[PDB]
Amino acid sequence: DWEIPDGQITVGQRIGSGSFGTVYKGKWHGDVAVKMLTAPTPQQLQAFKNEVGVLRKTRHVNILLFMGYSTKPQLAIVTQWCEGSSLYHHLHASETKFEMKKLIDIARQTARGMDYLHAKSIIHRDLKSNNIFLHEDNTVKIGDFGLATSGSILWMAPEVIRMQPYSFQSDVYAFGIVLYELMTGQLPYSNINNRDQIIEMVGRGSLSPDLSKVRSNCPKRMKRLMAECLKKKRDERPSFPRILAEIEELARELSG
Ligand SMILES: C[C@@H](NC(=O)c1ncnc(N)c1Cl)c1ncc(C(=O)Nc2cc(C(F)(F)F)c(Cl)cn2)s1
Numbered sequence: 001d002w003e004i005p006d007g008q009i010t011v012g013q014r015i016g017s018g019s020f021g022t023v024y025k026g027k028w029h030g031d032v033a034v035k036m037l038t039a040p041t042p043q044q045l046q047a048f049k050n051e052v053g054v055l056r057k058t059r060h061v062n063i064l065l066f067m068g069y070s071t072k073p074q075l076a077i078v079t080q081w082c083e084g085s086s087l088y089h090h091l092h093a094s095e096t097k098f099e100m101k102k103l104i105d106i107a108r109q110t111a112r113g114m115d116y117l118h119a120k121s122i123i124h125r126d127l128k129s130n131n132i133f134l135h136e137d138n139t140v141k142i143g144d145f146g147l148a149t150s151g152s153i154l155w156m157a158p159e160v161i162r163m164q165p166y167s168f169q170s171d172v173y174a175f176g177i178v179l180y181e182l183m184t185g186q187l188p189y190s191n192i193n194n195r196d197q198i199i200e201m202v203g204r205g206s207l208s209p210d211l212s213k214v215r216s217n218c219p220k221r222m223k224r225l226m227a228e229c230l231k232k233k234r235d236e237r238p239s240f241p242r243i244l245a246e247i248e249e250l251a252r253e254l255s256g
Helices: 042-055 087-092 100-119 168-184 196-204 220-229 240-254
Strands: 010-017 022-027 031-036 066-070 076-080 084-086 132-135 139-142
Touching: 010 031, 042 066, 042 076, 084 087, 087 132, 087 168, 100 132, 100 139, 100 168, 100 240, 168 220, 168 240, 220 240
Parallel strands: none
Antiparallel strands: 010 022, 022 031, 031 076, 066 076, 084 132, 132 139
16 A cells, blocks of 8 residues: 555645645655645545546656655645656746757657556546656656646647547647647647637637647658647547657657
8 A cells, every 4th residue: 555654744845726735845755745635525535536546557757756645634645756847837938948859858758658658548638738847857757737626728639628528539639739839839829819719619620720830940750740649530640659659760860
């Protein structure tokens, strides 16, 4: 069992509040991060066990290392502490300009982690550049840092907006949107004023990311893989084994 006894974790500075919990930087055999959740509902009790039950089946370098959980005194999830910023903070706030060599490496590590999740039959359900942490500004760490559960429509597939929806291809579309941010430095649909139409237009199949805003030095394989990841039909979107294979081969083309 991975239950951490009460009294071992030294809760420290608060990292950021949410509508569903708060996260602190704790001390527990080193630097750790603890997300603690007044009265737990039967849903919150199950939602906590679902998030821990998913993190228990993860043991990969590109996935945030789950370390333990606690029920006393509060429902908590203990993970490793990583320094740096998320990919959304690098490309759309800090404006960190990466070499094309490193942009492919960030996409490669992201595809490696997404490949490992699908092997374990795990759907991320909320893959975005904000949930992609750059540990030491080098290693990609995939997690779910959402503290409210929905301001994350740019990464939602058309079939996810049309409630009939989470699948491997829905995560592939999110990965395709992340590729758009990497190759453009901007979020999709930046020229749209409100989000009412973005929900309606993308769900209707008449709004797609303008694939001409990509940088000049973007390889032709990245433009083709990004387009296939953004197909409106789910069955026309590839699987991450095929996605990772073409990126790792493309990556070896840049290293001399
Ligand atoms: C305690 C808190 N840790 C931090 O926030 C943090 N960690 C490192 N460095 C920092 N600076 C910070 Cl601030 C977290 N508890 C659970 C987290 C999580 O990702 N759960 C999760 C993961 C997956 C995945 F399988 F896709 F990965 C899925 Cl599918 C669904 N849920 S994250």
